[PDB]
Structure formats: structure tokens, C-alpha cells
Design a protein around this ligand. Sequence first.
Ligand SMILES: CC(=O)SCCNC(=O)CCNC(=O)[C@H](O)C(C)(C)COP(=O)(O)OP(=O)(O)OC[C@H]1O[C@@H](n2cnc3c(N)ncnc32)[C@H](O)[C@@H]1OP(=O)(O)O
Ligand SMILES: CC(=O)SCCNC(=O)CCNC(=O)[C@H](O)C(C)(C)COP(=O)(O)OP(=O)(O)OC[C@H]1O[C@@H](n2cnc3c(N)ncnc32)[C@H](O)[C@@H]1OP(=O)(O)O
Ligand SMILES: CC(=O)SCCNC(=O)CCNC(=O)[C@H](O)C(C)(C)COP(=O)(O)OP(=O)(O)OC[C@H]1O[C@@H](n2cnc3c(N)ncnc32)[C@H](O)[C@@H]1OP(=O)(O)O
Ligand SMILES: CC(=O)SCCNC(=O)CCNC(=O)[C@H](O)C(C)(C)COP(=O)(O)OP(=O)(O)OC[C@H]1O[C@@H](n2cnc3c(N)ncnc32)[C@H](O)[C@@H]1OP(=O)(O)O
Lengths: 396, 396, 396, 396
Amino acid sequence: TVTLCSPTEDDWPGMFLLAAASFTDFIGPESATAWRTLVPTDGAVVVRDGAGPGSEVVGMALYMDLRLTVPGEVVLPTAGLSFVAVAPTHRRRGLLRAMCAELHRRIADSGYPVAALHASEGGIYGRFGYGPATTLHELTVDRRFARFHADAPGSSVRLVRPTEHRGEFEAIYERWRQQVPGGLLRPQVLWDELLAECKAAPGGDRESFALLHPDGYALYRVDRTDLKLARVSELRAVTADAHCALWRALIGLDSMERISIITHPQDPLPHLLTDTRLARTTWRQDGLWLRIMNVPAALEARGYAHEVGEFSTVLEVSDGGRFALKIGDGRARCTPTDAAAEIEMDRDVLGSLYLGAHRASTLAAANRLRTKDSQLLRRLDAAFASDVPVQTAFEF
Amino acid sequence: TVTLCSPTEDDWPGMFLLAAASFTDFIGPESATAWRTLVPTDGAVVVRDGAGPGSEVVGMALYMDLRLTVPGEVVLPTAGLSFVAVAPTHRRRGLLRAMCAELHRRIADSGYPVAALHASEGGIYGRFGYGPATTLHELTVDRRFARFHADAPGSSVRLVRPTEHRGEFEAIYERWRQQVPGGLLRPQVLWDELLAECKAAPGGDRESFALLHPDGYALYRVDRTDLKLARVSELRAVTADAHCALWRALIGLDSMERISIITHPQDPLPHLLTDTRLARTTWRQDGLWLRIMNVPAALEARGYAHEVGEFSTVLEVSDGGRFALKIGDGRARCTPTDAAAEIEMDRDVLGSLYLGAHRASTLAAANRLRTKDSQLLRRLDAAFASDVPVQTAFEF
Amino acid sequence: TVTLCSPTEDDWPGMFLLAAASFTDFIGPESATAWRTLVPTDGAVVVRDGAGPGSEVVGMALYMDLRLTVPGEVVLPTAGLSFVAVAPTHRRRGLLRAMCAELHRRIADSGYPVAALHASEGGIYGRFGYGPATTLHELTVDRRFARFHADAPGSSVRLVRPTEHRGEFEAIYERWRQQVPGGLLRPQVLWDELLAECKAAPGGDRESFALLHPDGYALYRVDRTDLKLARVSELRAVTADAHCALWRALIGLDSMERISIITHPQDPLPHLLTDTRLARTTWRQDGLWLRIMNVPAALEARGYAHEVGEFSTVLEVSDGGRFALKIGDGRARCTPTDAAAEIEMDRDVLGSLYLGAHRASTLAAANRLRTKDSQLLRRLDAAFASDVPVQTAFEF
Amino acid sequence: TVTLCSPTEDDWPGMFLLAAASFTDFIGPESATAWRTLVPTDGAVVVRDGAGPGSEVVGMALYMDLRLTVPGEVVLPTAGLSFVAVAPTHRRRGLLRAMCAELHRRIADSGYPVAALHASEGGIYGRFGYGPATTLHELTVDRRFARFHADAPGSSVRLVRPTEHRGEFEAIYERWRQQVPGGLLRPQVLWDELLAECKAAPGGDRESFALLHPDGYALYRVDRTDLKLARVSELRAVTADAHCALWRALIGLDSMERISIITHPQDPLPHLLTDTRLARTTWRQDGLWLRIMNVPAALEARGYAHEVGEFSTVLEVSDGGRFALKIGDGRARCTPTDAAAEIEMDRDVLGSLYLGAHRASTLAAANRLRTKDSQLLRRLDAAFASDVPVQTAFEF
Ligand SMILES: CC(=O)SCCNC(=O)CCNC(=O)[C@H](O)C(C)(C)COP(=O)(O)OP(=O)(O)OC[C@H]1O[C@@H](n2cnc3c(N)ncnc32)[C@H](O)[C@@H]1OP(=O)(O)O
Ligand SMILES: CC(=O)SCCNC(=O)CCNC(=O)[C@H](O)C(C)(C)COP(=O)(O)OP(=O)(O)OC[C@H]1O[C@@H](n2cnc3c(N)ncnc32)[C@H](O)[C@@H]1OP(=O)(O)O
Ligand SMILES: CC(=O)SCCNC(=O)CCNC(=O)[C@H](O)C(C)(C)COP(=O)(O)OP(=O)(O)OC[C@H]1O[C@@H](n2cnc3c(N)ncnc32)[C@H](O)[C@@H]1OP(=O)(O)O
Ligand SMILES: CC(=O)SCCNC(=O)CCNC(=O)[C@H](O)C(C)(C)COP(=O)(O)OP(=O)(O)OC[C@H]1O[C@@H](n2cnc3c(N)ncnc32)[C@H](O)[C@@H]1OP(=O)(O)O
């Protein structure tokens, strides 16, 4: 009756239909490249309603091969789930759960240590062992009142057309994503897609003008309806001077009232200004989500805080076994075991901690991670913290 | 021309006038008590147009004796600036600056370690040495979709008339403030104020109600116009079990479409729900600001992370002296010095970093605090962190 | 523990709290009159948390002696549920279900053929055997353009002070409710209340005025905020001429832009105007709900369309026994039986038909009332219609 | 002075100017086809300013050949007026009255028993003998709270590209319109237009997708700006089951918050849900308007309610002559008479009653329909009713 499998040339039309209705943003021409370019052999799956070539496609999901920067500037190959969809005619038949379990096994066999996604909704993926792992705050600062603090660092920047500086953006982005927990390698095909979206579209987005610095850039587009608002689609800075030079320039768009940007909680913008309130937060939400596929691999992969002295504990993941984890001198040793578990937690929660965006003590407060040793809490809080604040790279 | 000095009895009326026209929330009857029983003798100063008694009151500013909890569960006597006002007629004449110079002087003399306030605007007090020290998050939660996580702790709480449980509120409050950095001793005169406010005002706010658990409580008043919005004026809890029980009951306001609360960034509410987002962040702003009056006094009083290995640096506060600072064992020694400064900052930067609500590394990136050692940045971040996350008490 | 009982004197306060925290419209002094003068001995019920006197009140519900005009102008004493509440701390533990079961046992033993309520939400009382039985249409008319048709009937009306003409209103309202299915007799305590609400409340509703006509009246008041909107709280007309006369005068309120009223689907107001669209439906929702307590009594009490030819059938009510139903000469005869059921439905469906507001054929398309014979659908459609279209009396 | 005549080939441009400047939705290319294809030679007329080829077009109006289904599954040839426009520079000189009189004579002279239109404004066509004959209810349903009742009927339907199933749709819509009062025959040239209007348009509507059942279908698209809102363009169902299963699917659009749709008052959606309120009515207005050209032909053409007993009366239509109307066994005999009229009414009232969308009892309360005999009034309500509730086909 219902089949779950890797597509063949026959399901393509099924997937194309399902994808278009399901994703408002999605279109056929732009989409064809992404999948060919970023999806491994059998990192894609479809649910067929029956059997026979041409059997209707009622579910799809696939993962891309991407490189994630975790704390300590390590890069972990990462499975990135995307284009997850069930047809509206088949809701609640276990199809999403089935598709994830299949994808997870393949990722596990492929030797990925983590998986990742951006959630359409907040309540879906926790059950499949994804915890939210970065935070995205919409930023809008009125530009009419902003003055830079006397301390702020800093003309060393140029207004340019984006299509004429792709190479510069690429270099800059590559340095940045290698330095920031959350960075993702952006392959040529996504520069293509990102680059094209700069050109104005009839009935859609306006032309986008870049701000270019040797160690940073910013792409910004005037809003479609509110002609007094500028939207920064992306800002990349490797140094604090470029970050501040770019902001002085954005603040400099005198024909604008407001500037808005998606950014991280540790963005220093507020502090560059005389009135930190001007860089107001207008939206707060989860960004990238992580699933730890291989506990030992994942915990040994990432660097830890040096500023916490050596300690040892047994961590138990609900129905993922037990682990002896040792962290000292910024490194971890994690191996399976059978000793009593000093601390226990669902798999999704471990993800939430993996990058440093969530403190273990808060989750503890919500009974999402348990233990009887208050001292161990503080140590994990400390250990798992990121020296460099986590940043979100691009949605996928 | 004009004249700065302590207010006599003849100056009262004039001040109330100035206050009512400066602060839309002011009231003549309600304040007389808080100002009178909480403002120390000669804690209040005014500026008069010319001389000869009863001169027109044009500037005013006073402070209150309050006890602030800081990291390590230590209470510091604190001076809380309030009813700072210059008349519309005398703006930008240095009255605010002069009134500040005067009170800081008195405050220094009188033996206060530091002075705190709440800021009407965002770019007034930094120059005077105040730095934003805690963060306010408005959470707006859609009650209808909320569902508690299986991990969530939890009937032990009863819907009560606030004026009937003063004692149990007060005791609960006392437990909370002695445990939460940012906690404030609540004066009896302020329990009066709060108890009185619960009553419905014709055309004003509606009656408040309370939810009472042995180890926590909540006051909530239905909003004046959105009859589908319950506003929580104050949520107080001392155990994870109370925090959750109270929320299980807030989500149980079935007639409400949403619940709103002013809380702190580390509030575990979101993690208690199967959907993290439902606890949407709506309004974000700075709350309690700190002016460190005595650097060694303050720095030595607060406890520090044990999970950071002992270390030594030389801190220079601009206009704040130079001290050799050493942290180890959760304690700090701070002693004058003329060695080269390894790290410098404006005085306000010290205050923001004092409760742990800001990371030294983020401020560094705005060049608000500067150093050439990166390992030290990390050490500060870790040292100044707070095992217990900072919470805000009550505006004043 | 959880005790379910008729409220004693010791409970009154417990209820005032539970009511005020449950219904924003609640007032203690005024509501005290209705339970006392309209609720039968043991027509009220409360749930107490535990044992001891003055235990806390965590659920409440009561039923007032309701007189109802059903089709045929027949008046049936009916139990009207009101002030149903379960505390937010005790929601989902079966208290509503428990309070209902009990009141129902009381209502049946007392002889009431049927029960009625107004539902706070739409998904509650179906499972208890109440169906939405009347429709409310909120009508907003932009009178700046309203012109009367040449056929519209019609200064035989007067502008009056409502509190000077209570008796005229009682007499008028008396004739009206005896004639219209949906009428309820309005007792003296309720007229006290209605008249009381006509006076201005500081920070509340403005003074109400009345339009008085020999065969009808309208009470209306200018809206609190929108000074160009008139709210008619009540319009009662015995004659088509009264209805038109009243609206002529309301369209005559030259200082208003809109007039709004809550009325029924067959209100002929639109057809009085040269442009039907001017009476725009700005709100539609279920109104009175009916639970048939005694199927034979209720069915025999109600009038039925004379035009439809006589006929017999056997109607089953889901777990409510089977029933021989004969309709002829606009009358019914209905007695328990054991014949095969020709038609069947959940008790609440019957409620929805009882007053002609919902077609048998419509309910059947949703499989809510089930029959193997089509002819019988159409016969039920014809029969249960009401010559006079059902209107809504007052909310309770 | 001015002239009224049939449009020659030289008037085509002027007509496109007038049409385009009087209708915001008008497009020259799409329209070309319907008028030539659907407008009969001579079914169109224009008014000119002056004489001499080239004169400017200041008035147009035409009719199309339509097939309307009326009670009894009977299909009347009908005349549909559309593209009625007087230039803003000639408003109020009688051009419409002049254009209507001419069209009506041609329409009668050609042997149509009934003309129909959609009214741009509600106070325009009544004077010309047209009366509102169907009702449109705009229903917005929040998808998230919707749960199907345990009784509801119902994977038997699938998500498809509309242009790949023209035949399946043509079939279904064909069975629909033959069964439902209000049905229209859809011309191949209009299926052309419907299919084309399904492709996305830059700055316009988004791609339409469809839901396809053996016995029904639904075309929907996500809204232009409201990305959480799904507009159903048209919904066709011939079985209750289809109607349900299609609604089971639209509710299955999880990415959406709201589905909206235009339908009729007797839509059973709400009764499919656990909460009838979820099927909120957000708009309600008259749809198809009818003018009975030929009283006997029309009254003898449509089937009547069987469940009313044979009866007789005298029906007098102002300006429409007098008739002995006799209804027996669901059929009507209507013949010329000079006997005393038992009931009188304007031509448009008869329009309104014709498809069963309005009750005579209600139009009588407006004194639009007049009789001294209430029993007679009940008999008309009963007889004119429809076994199948009337729905609206398409706007023309
Ligand atoms: C961009 C990315 O690819 S990530 C964003 C996801 N993409 C989309 O959501 C596209 C549109 N929406 C959909 O396609 C569907 O709603 C899907 C794919 C999310 C759901 O698939 P389904 O087959 O209906 O879910 P499935 O029944 O397999 O899941 C089972 C459980 O998940 C739950 N579930 C499914 N959707 C949701 C939801 N939106 N919120 C909470 N729980 C959910 C079910 O309640 C069920 O509960 P259970 O664990 O007790 O069994
Ligand atoms: C609850 C509490 O009491 S805290 C909130 C304070 N109360 C109020 O704001 C009441 C209404 N507003 C006011 O009373 C006035 O605006 C005050 C008291 C805040 C300002 O006093 P003033 O005398 O007008 O300012 P003054 O000239 O003395 O201050 C000097 C400096 O502060 C700066 N300053 C004063 N107000 C502001 C402001 N709103 N934003 C930024 N800078 C400001 C001046 O620009 C000036 O800058 P400078 O250092 O380069 O010279
Ligand atoms: C003016 C009047 O008095 S009439 C309007 C009703 N009064 C109110 O709503 C007052 C404010 N709200 C409340 O007091 C509560 O939410 C109540 C009284 C509606 C609910 O009572 P509760 O005791 O919490 O629910 P209870 O457990 O008794 O009900 C049982 C069933 O009804 C259902 N139910 C209760 N409330 C709702 C609701 N708002 N919507 C849908 N279903 C509901 C439950 O789902 C439960 O379902 P189940 O059969 O699967 O177990
Ligand atoms: C989709 C369709 O094709 S059907 C809908 C019609 N289309 C449009 O209306 C498009 C834009 N509007 C117009 O073109 C014009 O307003 C028209 C065509 C409706 C009116 O034509 P006119 O030539 O100005 O009116 P005309 O003088 O011929 O009609 C006479 C009477 O009708 C009345 N009338 C005309 N328009 C209206 C109106 N919008 N509302 C009420 N009455 C009107 C006049 O009052 C006039 O009064 P009277 O009965 O006392 O004599």
C-alpha cells in the first residue's frame, strides 16, 4: 500500500508537484540545481502511495552534504535535512516519522556525526532528536537617532553592485564561516542562487546594493512595500573593524528610517551606539537545529572551554546508551560504558547544548537534563560554552 | 542665577508638580510614602529658579536606600536614583549633570559601593557612569497551543485574592530576592503599594488575581482593552516545581487567548513546552543599570565562577583608577597599582559586566572594553558569569 | 476531597472570586440578584477543593428557571445554564462533565422538557447534548446612504429616557416574546438590571437612549471609543410597521455614520432599504443552545408546519431510547417504542433542529443525522421549519 | 444629441477603453474571447456621443447566452447582462435606463424567460426588475483548531496539477451544475480562461493547485501577501463524501493558518467540525440577481416542493400582469386572470423568491410582497423552497 524508497526518474514529477504546493517560496528552475549539486547518492527519499511506476508521490525528504563549523573552529561534515513534505491528503499517517527514521539510518551509516535542519514549526523535530542550537533575533534599529559611541572603531568601505564582486564576497564568506560556530560552507551553486536574487524581480524584491570592506560585506535591499525600511539580507564580517565600518555605512543610508537584519544574540551592534536601545530586538526565534548522530564522535570532535578545570562524568542519552565523557584542557574523551549515569537527557537536548547557544543549567531547570550533582551542571555549562558566540549561516 | 541644594518642606508641592508633568505614571498620594520612607535624609536634591525660599522648582533627583543581591548571594547596600527630572523650561542647561555630580558625591560619601537606576531613555546615563546590567524579555505565550513537555515537572496551587496572602507573598519574595542576583529587598511600604494596586480602577486597570504555590506565586491582571490577554505583573518562584505549576495554571486561563510576562533571558518557560516558540519573545529592553561607585569594594564583594582557574590582571577603569585584580576560588582581591594596564574600560562597562548579564568578549568587539590579550577576555567572560542567571526585581 | 454540592452560605465568597476570575463582565452586587431571584432551590452547584467548611471553590454552575417560546407560540419552562466555571487550577479533571451530569439529574427530576445555554466557546457543549439552536447576525448599517424602499411602510415614534418607560417596554416586550420562537419571559430582576445598564458608567458605556413606539422599542447608546457608531442593544417589534418605524428613526440619527445591532438571519432590515447591501453582515455565530431533556415532552410541545402532509416514523437518539413520531395537522405525537429506527442522531442534533434554525437535510450532509430514506429527510425539513422565524431573546 | 445602437467593428476600441476604465479587473486579451464566443450577434449595444463613424463610446451593455439550473434540475436558457458601463462624463442622463430597455426588449423578443447579472452595487438594478437570488457566504476557517466530528464521513483524493486534469474537472463540474440550483453551463472558452488563470503571475496570484476526488474537486492557491492563508477559488462536490474528503484535505494544508472560500449558506462545513465556530463567516452578500422576463414560462419551468399540499392563489406582479398560480405534486400551472389578486409584488421580488434563496415571509415583513393571508404566505415559503439548497456558479 505505502512504500518508502529512493526515487527514480519516475518520481521526479511527483516530487516537483509536492514541493511546489508545499513550499511557497520554492520554484522548479531554481530547485533543480540544488538537489543535483548538494544531495549525495541516496540522500533522498520519497513515499509512494502504492506500487507501480508512476505511483503517486505523497511524501519526500532529502539531506544535503554540508560542512558545519563547531566550537574550536573544527569542521564536521553535516547532514542537512531539507524539502521535508507530506502531501496534505496523507497527514498523520506516520509518514514524517517514517521518513526521518530512514534518513537517520543512512546518515548514521554514512558516518555523519550530526544532522541539522531549519524547522518550519517549533513542535515537530524535538521528537526526532533535534534540539534547537542557534538563536536568531530580528534586528531593527531606527537610523535617525543613531550616533556611534566615542569608543566605536573608525569610508574604508565602498557601495557596489553585488554581481560585480562575487569573488570578494566568496573570499570574505569563506574566512568567516571557518571562524564561527554555525558557519556553513557555501558551495558555488548557492552563490549562484544567492547572487541571482540580487537582481530586481517584477512583482517582487528590489535591486540589492552591497557594502564592501576588505574584511566584510553587507547585502541590503530596500523593502517592497515600506520604502523607508532597508533590509540587510546578509552581513559577513571577519574583524570588528569591518563590522563597525559596515554599520557606519548602513546607518548612513539617509533616505531610510529603519534598517533590519537577522543576526545573533551576541551581535555587538547595540554597544557600538550611544543609545543601545536603538538597535532594538523585534523578533526572537530558533535557527539551526542539531541531531547528534554519533555521541562519542560529536563530543570528541568539538573543542571545549580551557577556563574550566579537568573533570569526568557519565552522560546518558535516553535510548542512545551511556557514555563516559572526560573533558580537560579543551578536549573531550567520550566512550560508551555501563557505569551509573551521572547525568541523563533526551537526544534532542544534547543538540541544543552542542553549539553553546543554550546553557545546560537552564535546561536542567526545565527538567530536560537531570542529575543530582549541582557541581557537574556548572562544569558542563562552563565546558560546553563557546569562546566565539554562535552565528547562523544560511537557511536551507 | 539658579541654585542646587537639599529640598525643604516648602519644596514638596513643586516637586509633585514637576513629577506629574514629567512621568505619566506618577501620582501625588501614592508617592509621598515611597519617597518619604525610602529616601534617606538629604538623599533628595532640587534646583530652584533663583533664590529666596519657595523658588520655582526646576530640577529634581533623589536616591533610595535599597539592598541588591549580586552573584554569590551577597547583598550590597545600594542607592537607587529615581524621580530625576528637569523642567521643560530648563532643558539642556547642565541641570541633569550637576544633579548627578551632587548625588554621586553624597552617595560616595555616604558609603555606597554603587548606584543603580532604571532609564527612561537609552543614552542618558552611560556618560554618567551607568551601564545596563540586567535584561528584560517580554514573553507573550499563546495559551491555546501550549502543551507541556513529558519532561515537565507536574494542583498544588490555588486561585486566591492577593490581599489575603500578603504574608505568604512576602515570605516567598524574601526567599527569591536573597537567591537571585538582581533581587531587591522589598520594603513594607512597597508591599502596601503593590497590595493597593490590585484593586480595579474605574477606567483604569482591572482587578488583579494571584496564583499561590507553597514555593512561588504569580499576580496577573486581564488587560484593559484586549480582553483576551492576561498580563502577569509579577511571577515569583524559588523552585523548579513552583515555576512550572504556576505556568500550568497560567496556561489554564482558558478564557485568555494569550499570556504575557516580563522576565529574563534565561527563563526556562520555553523548554517546558513541546513547542519552544509558543513562548514568543515580544519586547526586549535593558532594565537595571549599575554605577560602580567603588571599584575594589564592588569587585571584591561579588562571588565568581569557581569553574575558572585562578589568574591575575591589571584593570584600568577610565577615571576609575588602576587596580591589580586577582581571581581565584570564587573570590577576588582588588588592590591599587601603577603597573601597566592589561585591560581598560569606561566606568559604565564595569557596571554592565557586574551582574553577568553581559559578556566581556561582546563588549570587546564594540571596543567598549579593550585589551591585547585574548586569553584574558575568555577568563573574564568565565569569571564574571553567574551560576544563577540574573533576574530583574522591580522598577523604581 | 473534590466535593460536589449545592452551595451553602459559606461558599458565596468562593464563587464571587471564581466568577470574577472567569468572566470579565462579572459584577458582584448585580449578579447576586439573579441567582437569588432566578435560580431554584438547588438549581446551583459548586465543586469544593477538599473537606472542611469554607473549602476553596474550584468549580461552579447553576440553572435559572427559563421560560421558552418554541414554534407554535407554545411556552416551555426551561432550565438555563449560566455561570459555568472551573478554576484554571483544576481544568481538565472532569469537573465540567461532573457539574453537568449533576445539574442534568436535577433538571430531569424537576420536569424541564429542555435546557438552554449560551456557549463561551463552540466545541464544549455538543458532547453533553446541546446543539446550537439559533443564529446571531451582527448587522452594521452605514446610514449615511440608507434610503427606504418605496414599499417600506410609513413620527409615530418618540425619543425617550429609558428609565422613564420601563413599563411600556415590559408590556411591549411581553407581547413580543409570546409570539416569537426564541422569546424568553424576562423577570423583574432582569428589567432592574437592563434599566441599570442604561445610565452612563464613568470609563464605561455612555448613556443609553430609547426609541418608543406603540408596538415596539429600541434601546441604543453611542459607543465608548468610536463616536460615530451607535450600538442598538435591543430592538423589539411586534408589528412589521413598528420594525420599520424604529429603523426610520435610527437611520435618522444624523450625527452617526454607522448603526450596529445584533439580530437574526430573517431580520427584514435589508429589504427595507433601496440597497440591500447597506445592512452588512459583520458577524455571524451560533446563539441559543438547546438540550432536549425529555424527547417525548419536547416534541409534543412544539408546533409543526401545517402544509406538510401527515406521516409517521421511528427516531433514535444515540443512547436516548427509540421513539415513535407521528406528525399531522401541525401537531406531534411521540411515544417510546421498539420499532426499527428509520432515522437516528446524537441528542444534540435534535436540539439544533428544535427551533427551525437548521435544516434536517443540511445536518444529514454532514452525517450528523442518519436515515436510509430521502423522503423522510425532506418531510423532517418541511415539518420542523418555523412559520415565524426564530429570534434571539437575551444572553444569560 | 446622442445615439443608442448596436456596436459595429469601429466601436471595439472605445468599448475596451470604457470597460477598462470602469472595471479594475478588466483585461483586453482575455475578454475578446468570451463576448464573441458567448455574446450573441446583436446581444450588445453602445451609446455614442454624436453621429458619424468615430463618435466616442460613452455607454455599453451586453448579454451572454447562459444556461441556469433552477429547482427541479431544470435548465433555463437565460440572458446574462455584463460589461454595463456609462462613462463618468455622462453619469445620470438615463443611459443605463436606455441601454437596459433596449437589451430587455431584445432579450424578451428573443424568447429568454430569465435574465441575470452580478451587481457592482446593490442599489442599482432593483428598479429594473432584478432581485438578489442567491447568497454568498465568505467563510474563513482557522485550519489549526479544526477537528472532524466523529460522525463525519471519511486518501481517496489526490493533489494534482489542475491543467493535467481538465477532463476530470469538466466532468465533475458538469454533474454539479445539472444538479444544483444556480448551476451554470461552463463553456469550453471559459474552461480555457480558468485553466490559464492557474499559472502564477509576476506581481499577481500564485500558482493554483487542485484536490481531485472521484466526485469532487477543489482549486486553491496561497494568498499573494498573506503567506499563511489559502484561498479556495472554487469548490465542486456532488456527493456529501466528496465534499467532506476534500475538506479533510484542505484542513491538511499544515503550512497554512487559514483556508478561505466563497460558498452558500447551507454549506455543511461547520457541521463537519467539532467546533462549528471554526467555519467562521467573514463576509456575506448577494450573488446572482434575477429578472423574470416571462412570469408563466418561469413559474411553470421550475419544480416545486412536494411536501406542500396542492393549493391555489392569484399572483399579481406589478407591471407583470396577473396570474392564477396553482401548485400540485411539485408542479405549477400559471395562467392569465383578472380575478382579485391574493398577493402582489414587484418584478424583482419574484426574482428573489425564484431559486429559493429568500423566504416570502421575510419579504412580506418588508412589505415588498403583500397579502392579507398569512396561511398563503406559509404555502409560498414552503413551495418555493429547494430540495437542494441553491449555490452560486461563477461571476460573469
Ligand atoms: C524546511 C524543512 O524541510 S523543515 C520544515 C517541515 N516542512 C513542512 O512542514 C511542510 C508542510 N507540512 C507538512 O508537510 C506536514 O505537516 C509534516 C511533514 C510536518 C507532517 O508529516 P506527518 O506524516 O503528518 O507527521 P507524522 O504523523 O509522521 O508524525 C507523527 C507525530 O508527529 C506529530 N506532528 C506532525 N506534525 C506536527 C506539528 N506541525 N506539530 C506538532 N506535532 C506534529 C504528530 O502529532 C505525531 O505525533 P506522535 O509523535 O504522538 O505520533
Ligand atoms: C524613573 C527615573 O527617574 S529615570 C528617567 C528620567 N526622567 C526623565 O527623563 C523625565 C523627562 N525628561 C527629563 O527630565 C530630561 O530630559 C532629563 C532630566 C532626562 C535631562 O536633563 P537635562 O538637564 O535636560 O540634560 P543635561 O543638559 O543636564 O545633560 C547633559 C548631557 O546629557 C545629555 N542628555 C540629556 N538628555 C538626553 C537624552 N534623552 N538622550 C541622550 N542624551 C541626553 C545631553 O545631551 C548632554 O549631553 P552632553 O554630555 O554632550 O552635554
Ligand atoms: C456563561 C456560561 O456559563 S457558558 C460558557 C462556559 N464557561 C466557561 O468557559 C468558563 C471559563 N472556562 C472554563 O471554566 C473551563 O475551561 C470549562 C468549564 C469550559 C471546562 O471545564 P473543565 O472541567 O476544565 O473540562 P472537563 O474536563 O470537565 O470536560 C471534559 C471534556 O470536555 C472537553 N472540554 C473542556 N473545555 C473545552 C473547550 N474549551 N473546548 C473543547 N473541549 C473542551 C474536554 O476536552 C474534555 O474532553 P474529553 O471528553 O476528551 O475528556
Ligand atoms: C459586472 C457588471 O457588468 S454589472 C454592474 C454595473 N457596472 C458598473 O456600474 C460600472 C461603473 N458604474 C457605472 O458605469 C454607472 O454608475 C452605472 C452604469 C451603474 C449607472 O448609469 P447611469 O447612466 O449613470 O444612470 P441612469 O441615469 O441611466 O439610471 C437612472 C437611475 O438609476 C439610478 N442609478 C444609477 N446608478 C446608481 C447607483 N450606483 N446606485 C443607485 N442608483 C443608481 C439613478 O439614481 C437614476 O435614478 P432614477 O431611478 O431616479 O432615474
